[PDB]
Amino acid sequence: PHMSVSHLVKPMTKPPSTKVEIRNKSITFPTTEPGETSESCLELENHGTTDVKWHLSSLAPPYVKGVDESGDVFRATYAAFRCSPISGLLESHGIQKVSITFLPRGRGDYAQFWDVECHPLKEPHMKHTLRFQLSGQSIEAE
Ligand SMILES: [Cl-]
């Protein structure tokens, strides 16, 4: 019987280029009328000491269920969600609000995956990715 002298291997460390945070990876808009808009926001926060270049992009078009009685999920042919701004430079210790709108065109339950891509301005190779998801349903008022 003896004390262990072993350790878990640790081949990688998270560098300072990963110090950019979003607080919620999911927003669910309230139930929104077709053709009306609903509004929410997320924030990017740069906890590092460098200026960070960032850009948001959707990973695929919105996917929508409950459009008809088929039991199929469809892809929307339009941008049901919009983010503003979609790119920028975020200074050290800065917080950027991203305003997000949901503008359905018809009954359905909508969602979409997005990511934020960022890196320190001076080190474009030191990339960091943040996933978020958007969702909301559209029901007509009776
Ligand atoms: Cl997807």
Q: What is the DSSP string of 57-117?
A: EESSS-EEE-SSSS---EE-SS-SEEEE--EEEE-TT-EEEEEEEE--SSSEEEEEEEEEE
Give the determination technique.
Answer: X-ray
- Secondary structure string (H, E, C) spanning 45-66: EECCCCCEEEEEEECCCCEEEC
For 79-108, letters b (16+ CB in 10 Å) and e give: ebbebeeeebebeeeeebebebbbbbeeeb
Range of the domain at 93: 1-142
**What is the CA(114)–ligand 1 centre distance, in A?**
9
Residues having C-beta closer than 5 Å to ion ligand 1: 60, 113
Contact 48, 92 (CB under 8 A): yes
**What is the CA(34)–ligand 1 centre distance, in A?**
22
- Total domains in the fold of the chain: 1
- This structure's resolution (angstroms)? 1.0
